[PDB]
């Protein structure tokens, strides 16, 4: 019986491939063929944030657009003041094998996790004056690959055991488990209203989830290698995806396919990070060729490079007001561009 | 830094940078060793001194005023490619092989680790455990069962030396050395064998840092 039903699954996949074929009226390239280009985006390094000893794996901005956390494998989590380069806090971690970090949108909490399969929540406003661990969420079976706050009581974590999870920080238990990827989930990105989120995995697949429901709504399959980076468009109706085959792609949640492809023949190394500018006209992508490229997100031109790092650009981020871009890297420095 | 509160904030920032450097000095005098055995070999048993810290397990000991840190990642059953760059900066890899089904699996693992793009310049210490159990089952079960191209007389002196050649033939890089030592698994000698081999890595690292080969 199991062969006959997957035989029906083979034609049921043919239906959704034909519905994607039926909706393909015109390319996004020929629709945007007449609008003016962005020109040439030249940014300069404003700050350089020195003080990490080992290499930097993650950074996240605060919603006030001034403070930022960075994680590194010397075992320290450092909160920076980006305007003055001051170190506000330095949090010594238990396990120095950290791969992700997050800022709460309130500003009171900071999360981190990695090869210990634990998402630790740190309280910043203590009334004793020191940063301490408020909860360490332990239910994943693989390494923690990403974590994002919904509010101060809910966090969504990605993991390498092919599973995303929704937690309750008050009680410290999983609320909703998101299964369906066959490879390790390497990244996730929240929708601006935080009702959906996308997650890209090692089986070259992206999946659109539903937070209060718990189901997979859409599956997007265009890449040929492992997806490392994902980011939502600012209005929440598209997302961008960067993978190891040196390609970014723009998918859209309403037409259920890919729109544009961002690739160059000189580019042979994989994307580590992507983010969008505040209008969604630029797409910044961090690479293993040690620099970042700015892509015209609507015409797929490459307009600008951010080349200042001696090693691989591991993380990347744009502020909420849209002023600065911070890129961290394996040469143990963060920079800020404008 | 003009304000009275901007002065005291900058004084706090400088106090953090000093404590960050005092931690980077204490941690740089550490030897980090990555344990990469296959399944159950001898990796969790070669750690003579047990001072621990499912995730990642770290055991540490000190030997001749030198502090060793051993990172087992056997419980990380994920895709190995994703977290292998975390250990790019270790001194050596300690590979354990059980000589007593898991033989060609251990070789294909060793081919992946030795030819990794992060593990060129990273030398390997190859232990070969349980030679006290390899010594008698070779009398009952010859090496032509698993290695069919073995053309030797089925002697423990050269069956163990032929298997050692099968691992060292995967090297394919001159910038890294494979040290090798057949552990009896009843030996209080693995602390010294690691210590003698780590010294030869540090000398050859210093010859590379002084521009002298």
């Amino acid at each position, epitope marked *: 019986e199991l062969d006959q039903l997957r035989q029906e699954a083979e034609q049921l996949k043919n239906q959704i491939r034909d519905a994607r074929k039926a909706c393909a009226d015109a390319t996004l390239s020929q629709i945007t063929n007449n609008i003016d280009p962005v020109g040439r985006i030249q940014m300069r390094t404003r700050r350089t944030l020195r003080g990490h000893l080992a290499k930097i794996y993650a950074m996240h901005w605060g919603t006030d657009s001034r403070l930022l956390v960075s994680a590194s494998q010397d075992g320290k989590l450092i909160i920076w003041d980006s305007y003055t380069t001051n170190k506000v806090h330095a949090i010594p971690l238990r396990s120095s094998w950290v791969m992700t970090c997050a800022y709460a949108p309130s500003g009171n909490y900071v999360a981190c996790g990695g090869l210990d399969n634990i998402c630790s929540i740190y309280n910043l406003k203590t*009334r*004793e004056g*020191n940063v301490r661990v408020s909860r360490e969420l332990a239910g994943h079976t693989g390494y923690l690959s990403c974590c994002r706050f919904l509010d101060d009581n809910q966090i969504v974590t990605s993991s390498g055991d092919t599973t995303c999870a929704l937690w309750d920080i008050e009680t410290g238990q999983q609320t909703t488990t998101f299964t369906g990827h066959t490879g390790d989930v390497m990244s996730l990105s929240l929708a601006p209203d935080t009702r959906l989120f996308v997650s890209g995995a090692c089986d070259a697949s992206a999946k659109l989830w539903d937070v209060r429901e718990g189901m997979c709504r859409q599956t997007f399959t265009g890449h040929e290698s492992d997806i490392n980076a994902i980011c939502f468009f600012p209005n929440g109706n598209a997302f961008a995806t960067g993978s190891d085959d040196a390609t970014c792609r723009l998918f859209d949640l309403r037409a259920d396919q890919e729109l544009m492809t961002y690739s160059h023949d000189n580019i042979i190394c994989g994307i580590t990070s992507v983010s969008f500018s505040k209008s969604g006209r630029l797409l910044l992508a961090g690479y293993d060729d040690f620099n970042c490229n700015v892509w015209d997100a609507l015409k797929a031109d490459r307009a600008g490079v951010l080349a200042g790092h001696d090693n691989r650009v591991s993380c990347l981020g744009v502020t909420d007001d849209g002023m600065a871009v911070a890129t961290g890297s394996w040469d143990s420095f963060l920079k800020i561009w404008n | 830094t003009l*304000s009275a*509160e901007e002065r*005291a904030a900058l004084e*706090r920032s400088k106090a953090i940078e000093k404590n960050l450097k005092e931690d980077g000095i204490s941690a740089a005098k550490d030897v980090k060793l990555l344990l990469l055995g296959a399944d159950n070999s001898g990796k969790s048993t070669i750690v003579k001194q047990m001072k621990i810290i499912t995730g990642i397990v770290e055991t540490h000991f000190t030997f001749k005023n030198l502090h060793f840190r051993l990172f087992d990642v056997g419980g990380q059953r994920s895709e190995r490619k994703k977290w292998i760059h975390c250990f790019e900066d270790v001194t050596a890899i300690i590979f354990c092989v059980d000589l007593s089904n898991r033989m060609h699996e251990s070789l294909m693992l060793f081919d992946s680790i030795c030819n990794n793009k992060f593990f060129i310049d990273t030398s390997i210490i190859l232990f070969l455990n349980k030679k006290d159990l390899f010594g008698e089952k070779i009398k009952k079960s010859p090496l032509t069962i698993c290695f069919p191209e073995y053309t030797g007389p089925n002697t423990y002196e050269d069956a163990a030396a032929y298997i050692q050649a099968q691992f060292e033939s995967k090297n394919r890089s001159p910038n890294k050395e494979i040290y090798c030592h057949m552990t009896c698994a009843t030996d209080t000698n693995n602390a010294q064998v690691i210590f003698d081999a780590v010294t030869d890595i540090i000398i050859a690292n210093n010859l590379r840092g002084c521009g002298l080969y």
Partner: single-chain antibody, 232 residues
Framework: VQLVESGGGLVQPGGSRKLSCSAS????????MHWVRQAPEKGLEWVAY????????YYADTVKGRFTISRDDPKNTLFLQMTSLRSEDTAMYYC??????????????WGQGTTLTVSSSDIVMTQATSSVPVTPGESVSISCRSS???????????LYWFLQRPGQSPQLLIY???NLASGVPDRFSGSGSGTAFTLTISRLEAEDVGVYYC?????????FGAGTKLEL
């Protein structure tokens, strides 16, 4: 979190006395500490300051030369060595903690007081009103005025508000001219202009009766305002 001070009593003038302040319940090594005294019927008056790690020490110019502040981070104590005691040093001395980074709340916990009884270029903060007759439920507005603009080029206006209930130590209400402190209700509010500042209470309750001070933190020495008392 608590601070408890000891070592106050009747002292002959010209002599000496040591004041101790032992801290319990917080990471004492990362807070800077202040001494603030209160004359037997007058308002608050800043005395000394030691930072975290003792790398910065300031004194009031009244006591510069004859008082010495010091801290013991292994024992979690604070010291004020007082020499050449005049009869103007009869006061009640408060031990205040304050931590400084971006977005913090300085001057947020105050000690209990020691009664020391000696035998017998600055910025001036002006609270010209000194007494208002107040009824509960009504709307109060306390106004403070400065002889220099407390607004800085960074954007902050370093003006703080404190409330001292009858028989208690002061307590921070508003920090940096608009920020409501943690633990105080939402009915307090602060507005400013750079030179004139206002504290508005929306509806009065019985837990708001006391003396209201304004402080500046733009530059040292820190100068309080005179007391604006609220009564029934």
């Amino acid at each position: 979190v608590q601070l408890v001070e000891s070592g106050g009593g009747l002292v002959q003038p010209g002599g000496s006395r040591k004041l101790s302040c032992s801290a319990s319940g917080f990471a004492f090594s990362s807070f800077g500490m202040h001494w603030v005294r209160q004359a037997p019927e007058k308002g608050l008056e800043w005395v000394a300051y030691i930072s975290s790690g003792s790398g910065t020490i300031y004194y009031a110019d009244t006591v510069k030369g004859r008082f010495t502040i010091s801290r013991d981070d292994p024992k979690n104590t604070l010291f004020l060595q007082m020499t050449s005691l005049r009869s103007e040093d009869t006061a009640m001395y408060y031990c205040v903690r304050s931590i400084y980074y971006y977005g913090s709340s300085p001057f947020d916990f105050w000690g209990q007081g020691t009664t020391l009884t000696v035998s017998s270029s600055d910025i001036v903060m002006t609270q010209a009103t000194s007494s208002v007759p107040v009824t509960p439920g009504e709307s109060v507005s306390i106004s403070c005025r400065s002889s220099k603009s407390l607004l800085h080029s960074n954007g902050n206006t370093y003006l703080y508000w404190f409330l001292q209930r009858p028989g208690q130590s002061p307590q921070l209400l508003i920090y940096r001219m608009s920020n409501l402190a943690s633990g105080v209700p939402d009915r307090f509010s602060g507005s400013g202009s750079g030179t004139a500042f206002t504290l508005t209470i929306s509806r009065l309750e019985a837990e708001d009766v006391g003396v209201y001070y304004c402080m500046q933190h733009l530059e040292y020495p820190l100068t309080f305002g005179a007391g604006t008392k609220l009564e029934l």
